[PDB]
Design a protein around this nucleic acid. Sequence first.
DNA 1: TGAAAAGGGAATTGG
DNA 2: CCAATTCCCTTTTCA
Length: 95
Amino acid sequence: GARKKLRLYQFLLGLLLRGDMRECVWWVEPGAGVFQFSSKHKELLARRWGQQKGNRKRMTYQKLARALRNYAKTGEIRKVKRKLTYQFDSALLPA
DNA sequence: TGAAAAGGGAATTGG
DNA sequence: CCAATTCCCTTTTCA
Ligand SMILES: *O[C@H]1C[C@H](n2cnc3c(N)ncnc32)O[C@@H]1CO
Ligand SMILES: *O[C@H]1C[C@H](n2cc(C)c(=O)[nH]c2=O)O[C@@H]1CO
């Protein structure tokens, strides 16, 4: 009996779709899947991610961005050439 | 002028 | 052994 936990891209996509923590992350170009983190309030979302996963240490945005870097391999999220800006693969977005 | 932002290697670990 | 987590290292920017 192995318990399921959220993946980072799901956590973030759920935040965006529901308009939660809109002070910490927001759509920049929603039709294109492009979103961006708040420069001042991103660590609050980071801590919320750590709690969500029940990790032993406090989650910081450095460790969160470090995690996002690995998605370059599988392609669910890529970094965009804009400050604290990222992009979801379009197969995660409606038509 | 140092915090922030951007990369990175790799050992680790819950499940 | 995935899917991050954790820790540490770098360079570049600019507020
Ligand atoms: O101690 C040096 C460096 C520091 N300082 C702060 N902001 C600076 C900019 N924009 N250019 C150069 N030096 C900067 O103050 C002293 C120089 O005035
Ligand atoms: O492919 C490897 C790793 C895999 N493995 C090992 C262990 C200890 C575990 O808990 N899960 C798991 O999938 O088994 C193969 C042999 O070690």
